[PDB]
Amino acid sequence: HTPMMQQYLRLKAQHPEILLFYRMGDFYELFYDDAKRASQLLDISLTKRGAEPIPMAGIPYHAVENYLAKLVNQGESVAICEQIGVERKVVRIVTPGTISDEALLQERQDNLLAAIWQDSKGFGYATLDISSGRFRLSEPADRETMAAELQRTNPAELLYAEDFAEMSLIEGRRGLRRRPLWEFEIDTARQQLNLQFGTRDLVGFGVENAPRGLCAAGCLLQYAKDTQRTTLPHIRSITMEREQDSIIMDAATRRNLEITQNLAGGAENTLASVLDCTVTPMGSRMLKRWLHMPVRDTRVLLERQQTIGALQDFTAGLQPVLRQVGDLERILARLALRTARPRDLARMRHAFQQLPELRAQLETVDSAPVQALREKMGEFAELRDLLERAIIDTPPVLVRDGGVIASGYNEELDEWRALADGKVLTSKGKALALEKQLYEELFDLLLPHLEALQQSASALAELDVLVNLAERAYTLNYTCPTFIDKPGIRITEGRHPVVEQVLNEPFIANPLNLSPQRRMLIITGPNMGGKSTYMRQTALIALMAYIGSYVPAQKVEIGPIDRIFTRVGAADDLASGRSTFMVEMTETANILHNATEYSLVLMDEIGRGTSTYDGLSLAWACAENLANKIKALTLFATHYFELTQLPEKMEGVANVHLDALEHGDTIAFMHSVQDGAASKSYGLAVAALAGVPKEVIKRARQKLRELESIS
Amino acid sequence: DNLLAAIWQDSKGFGYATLDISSGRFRLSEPADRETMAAELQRTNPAELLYAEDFAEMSLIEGRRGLRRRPLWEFEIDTARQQLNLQFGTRDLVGFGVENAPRGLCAAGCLLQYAKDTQRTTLPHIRSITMEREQDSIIMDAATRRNLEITQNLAGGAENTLASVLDCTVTPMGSRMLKRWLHMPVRDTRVLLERQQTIGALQDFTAGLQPVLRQVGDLERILARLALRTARPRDLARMRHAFQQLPELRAQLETVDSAPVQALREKMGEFAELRDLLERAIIDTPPVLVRDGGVIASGYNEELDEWRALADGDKVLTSKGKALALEKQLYEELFDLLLPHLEALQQSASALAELDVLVNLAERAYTLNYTCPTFIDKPGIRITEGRHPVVEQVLNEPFIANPLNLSPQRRMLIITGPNMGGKSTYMRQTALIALMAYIGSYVPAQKVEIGPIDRIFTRVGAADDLASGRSTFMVEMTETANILHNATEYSLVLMDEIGRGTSTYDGLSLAWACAENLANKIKALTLFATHYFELTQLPEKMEGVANVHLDALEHGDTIAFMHSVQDGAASKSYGLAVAALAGVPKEVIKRARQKLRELESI
Ligand SMILES: Nc1ncnc2c1ncn2[C@@H]1O[C@H](COP(=O)(O)OP(=O)(O)O)[C@@H](O)[C@H]1O
Ligand SMILES: Nc1ncnc2c1ncn2[C@@H]1O[C@H](COP(=O)(O)OP(=O)(O)O)[C@@H](O)[C@H]1O
Ligand code: VO4
Ligand code: VO4
Ligand SMILES: [Mg+2]
Ligand SMILES: [Mg+2]
């Protein structure tokens, strides 16, 4: 009704489904439906004011960042409106996918805005990180491949077309946003993408012949430009990810091998925890990204191994210098969006001061990869000179506070400030205005070098990951792997990376040889004898070899690995309609349909969850199909000793057995892999060690004698 | 009594241990209150006691039978854990369920050494160490809560959980109370009977009460802020709105004639004097912060009204400053008047939350066809036309209700059935129905008679923590050991398969012995799901054990599952047919059937 209410309503019409922090006075406020939703999510009191009461809720302007964090975590998008001239407009829209602020973001985790589009011929997925600037395009052609991409990327906000047919993988995701179908058109996407990259055609990127992916990227770029309400100079490339480029891992294999998250859900006791001691946050995020998507390009891996070897001697000197550089990638993003704070520019100055030390240390070491990283990082002599002169040694958190500009950067600014300290209100007001204007000019001077600075941030992060891997290799005794043309895995004195560090008792290393001649190894062993660790050590060694890192073994020769499949454990989803056998069988079906000669298949106790005869029969058929028709390199762990006779019937299958010694009705585990087979599982002994009551174990032993006597 | 005891004190709390010479019963406790430790010392009434030389409070054990003192080195945790592990022949004590009690284990280590010294005859008769708890709440382990999906699903998501089905509470305080009730289900019949009477009584008027309850909002946070005197001006206005709402709720509840409903009405209160103070002292729409001013309303203070007049038609600016200072002092004075009644207000916020949870439960019951459960003295569960609360809501197809009867006469049922038959859903439906009955809610069944349940044990998952040092069979055997050691006649033990990790003969042997022990000695109410059809021959050999078979019909390649519980053994599980439905390639299914024919033929 009132003119003020009419203005809020016009802006609300422009942004209907998002909470609007309309700025009245010094307090941001929400009205009508937004006020009720905000009060429940932000825990702020709701007070109704008559114009027809209008529900109104409010937060102080000083505390806005703390409140924005609560809504961003809940996945709500909050548009912030400020009075520019009272004339007002939405200055920025804060959404879980595109947050570049330090408080809203997490230091060692990346927030990715992603787009899913389903055309009749397969799916197209595009992911953009606003802070790093990385734009990646993909064309998954199966529901299973699309689900793996969503789980691996873990998109903070996913933009799906209204007509998306398979709203099952999408449903339950965080920050789902329905977007109109018009936004996904290919011709509109091509024109917008070409303008941002400044290229007439996308042939140089190599994304020109992918139609579905380009449609998703056009929606993602348009939403990102609208959400930030400014041109995004940080985004300058659209690389395309292909299945051939990286080893494929399904969502289950990633969780079973504990690459970044343990089976319970914590980050403790994970391969990333053992390998990640990186000094800078950029390094931690980059190492996690490499472990999730290993590279199958030999040239990229060989350069990474050569850098690790060259810097291994000088790691102790480089790590303290790298720690000072800090998270340059995030700081450059704020500079690109022109939203940086004085402290961020001081951190940028500190990193530039460290660059001369890093360049000198890298110059002494002689290797083609290390010299290329040294050339890319650069010196930035001009920028460090400007930052040191323009900004004070310890600047305030916010520009409005004042004191951001050091004396002597501008004679006029110093004179106005001196007059006020020595009309005083006029001089203070003029000084605050001039200091703000000079700060904007500093962004303009730093921005033309953004292309070089972004290249330097990637080089420094790469050096941090490679130096960390080199330091880890020296401390944990890892050695470099070598690559072979035909599919095979040969490991000497291999040890599981995580178990070796966590277990106080000495790890007993084991050898593995898998070749086209010996495609499958059936591991039969005493319970608690180490079979699962032996199988998982092979996958973790193979993943570590293909991320360019040194492997935890005396020597490893690894041939091409297209995909790694792990069937481990059993789980029930009663609400989804999936029984424990159904969940296991769909995973087994995925291995049988999608496996290739290059792929490595690790299967643990397949055929359990059903009667013994049905389980053994399905296990024999699945083993015969994998060894005879798929011809994949596979490791099968089984307590069904009937399957031990497969090698005699079929060539290309061998039996390996872990062994344990039984003493005085107690079990001692050698944990050593010896060729042959084991006919005893020692189940009652493991149960007694677990704490099953002695009376129960004695009756069980009596029953076992009776059952064995019957046959 | 023949009881040797030990006591310990530290910054974390107090630890205690008990050993009975006659029965070889070794138990530990960690009572964290001095008064609780004093009550425990009297309840145990130990023949002999051992305490730390530097125990801080000797008054708890100042006068005791044969009181003795032993050195600190005997009480050290690392030495104690190794000795206890060696005495029981176990790698870890996680299976006994006492691994996570540091103080309790430390006292137990001193008692074990002393017991060996006093008699070596009792030492071979000590085989277990269990915690002692007669807590009113039904005991549920962390694994049981996640397996039953009481509040959090196995993936970690909020959806597809029992709390999601029942959590439609209007106010945020109500949602917290329901989640707290689900985690601790009260076992005392009197409190539950009062809650059930309220749910039935307020069933007719749920639509009238819920809109008024929604207006009250969350008062727990506002009252906590008032206690720290950090309450915002708007938060005090929110309290005033709830005071205005309370007369309406009381009038609606006055027509109802149930003793529990009337008690809840009295606890809510009217707070007319507090409402009068807030209405007179605070403006209708107060500012977010008290610093700006305008929070106090004219007429609360005569001096402020006069200063406000002078402020608004440089000396005038000084008068404006005086007005802001007078207003802030009045605001602090307002907290002082409200705080004496803060204990009374806290009782009222709890009463309003209980009304919201019970009105919500009543609405859920009418919408979802739930019925009241009748408590019985002896330990038994009887369910007629029972349904699973979560599965029925998320399943588009109809749910097939299955009957359950468990008594001391028929304590154990071996459920055997086809894969995807519904055996696990049937076992869980019993657990969620028992928990729903014990929180005072209406159970999802036509009729339920639930007897006392001490603890609910669920052994379903099979996972390995390699870094921890336990394989999948050790993790499963650790859970089975906790079931056998900590089970009681009252406990409800649901076991989804055992021996799924070891070879068929070792697994069947452990399953036969664990099943015999639970029926013959523990005498717990057990539901056992199994694919070993050898165990279906256990019911004739052992009393209290019966067979329940789920039904399926096979036509050609596909299978249809009845989801109906009938008495019998099944004897066939259609694993290959379920694999074909899962999508295993036809050639793999064809080879599997050929091998199956050869295995059975020989
Ligand atoms: N070679 C080894 N040296 C030392 N410890 C080992 C070795 N192999 C396995 N272990 C230990 O065995 C446990 C895991 O055994 P696992 O392979 O899961 O057994 P299973 O699958 O037979 O039950 C962990 O304690 C792990 O540290
Ligand atoms: N009585 C029933 N009526 C209808 N559907 C049922 C019934 N019991 C189970 N289901 C469905 O079957 C699924 C599998 O049941 P479940 O007990 O897990 O079988 P099992 O564990 O024997 O494989 C459930 O998640 C549900 O979708
Ligand atoms: O994975 V095992 O503990 O059953 O040998
Ligand atoms: O899906 V089952 O738990 O009947 O093997
Ligand atoms: Mg294993
Ligand atoms: Mg089951």
Side-chain angles (χ1 to χ4, degrees), chain A residues 67-86:
Chain A
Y67 289 108
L68 290 166
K70 310 295 166 277
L71 275 158
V72 158
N73 300 329
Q74 285 130 23
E76 257 296 334
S77 154
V78 290
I80 291 161
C81 178
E82 297 180 1
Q83 38 169 32
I84 62 173
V86 187

Side-chain angles (χ1 to χ4, degrees), chain A residues 26-27 29 40 43-50 56-60 62 67 172 255 258 263-264 269 496 498-499 502-503 505 527-528 532-533 536 568-570 572-582 585-586 588-589 592-593 604-605 607-614 616-618 620-622 624-625 629 639-642 645 649 667 669 671 681-684 686-697 699-701 703-705 707-708 711, chain B residues 88-92 94-96 127 146 149 154 159-160 172 215 218 221 225 232 234-235 237-238 284-289 291-292 388 390-391 394-395 419-420 424-425 428 460-474 477-478 480-481 484-485 496 499-506 508-510 512-514 516-517 521 531-534 537 541 573-576 578-579 581-585 587-589 591-593 595-596 599-600 602:
Chain A
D26 180 65
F27 308 136
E29 285 158 16
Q40 290 150 350
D43 190 26
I44 47 166
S45 61
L46 170 63
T47 41
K48 300 192 179 184
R49 183 194 41 82
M56 274 173 71
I59 50 152
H62 65 80
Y67 289 108
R255 288 277 288 168
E258 297 188 334
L263 288 163
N269 303 340
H496 192 283
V498 182
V499 168
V502 301
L503 190 75
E505 292 160 347
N527 270 106
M528 274 212 67
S532 295
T533 308
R536 292 173 219 183
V568 162
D572 204 357
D573 197 340
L574 291 182
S576 293
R578 311 291 316 284
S579 69
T580 300
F581 200 69
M582 271 286 293
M585 284 298 112
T586 291
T588 292
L592 289 154
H593 291 301
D604 191 6
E605 205 59 35
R608 286 293 177 184
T610 183
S611 50
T612 282
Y613 282 127
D614 281 292
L616 173 59
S617 73
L618 198 45
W620 187 283
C622 183
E624 192 168 358
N625 194 260
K629 192 192 194 302
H639 278 273
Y640 290 126
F641 305 136
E642 293 91 3
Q645 81 198 10
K649 322 309 172 68
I667 189 73
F669 302 101
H671 304 290
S681 62
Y682 302 91
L684 300 188
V686 169
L689 187 72
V692 168
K694 300 190 82 76
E695 283 184 338
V696 171
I697 298 296
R699 177 72 190 86
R701 199 161 285 121
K703 180 70 171 183
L704 183 50
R705 288 194 305 278
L707 292 169
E708 289 167 335
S711 303
Chain B
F88 300 123
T90 68
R91 198 172 278 182
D92 211 334
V94 181
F96 296 123
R127 279 170 293 265
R146 200 140 178 171
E149 307 198 330
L154 286 163
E159 69 258 27
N160 298 324
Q215 291 297 291
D218 185 79
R221 286 152 166 178
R225 228 171 270 102
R232 294 228 312 272
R234 286 191 181 173
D235 292 332
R238 288 302 317 160
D284 300 329
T285 58
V288 57
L289 286 184
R291 181 184 36 70
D292 267 8
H388 194 289
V390 185
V391 176
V394 311
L395 189 73
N419 292 97
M420 285 265 289
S424 295
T425 298
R428 273 181 175 81
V460 168
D464 60 309
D465 298 323
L466 293 180
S468 305
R470 298 187 320 273
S471 80
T472 195
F473 203 81
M474 182 66 75
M477 284 303 110
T478 287
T480 65
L484 291 160
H485 280 298
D496 191 10
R500 207 76 275 185
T502 197
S503 184
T504 309
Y505 293 167
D506 294 28
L508 173 58
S509 290
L510 280 160
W512 190 273
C514 294
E516 279 194 328
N517 198 275
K521 306 193 192 281
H531 280 122
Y532 294 137
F533 316 132
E534 313 278 300
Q537 94 193 352
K541 298 163 180 200
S573 62
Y574 302 89
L576 290 190
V578 169
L581 183 98
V584 158
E587 73 190 331
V588 179
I589 298 288
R591 182 74 193 76
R593 292 186 197 273
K595 178 67 173 190
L596 191 62
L599 289 160
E600 80 190 342
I602 301 165

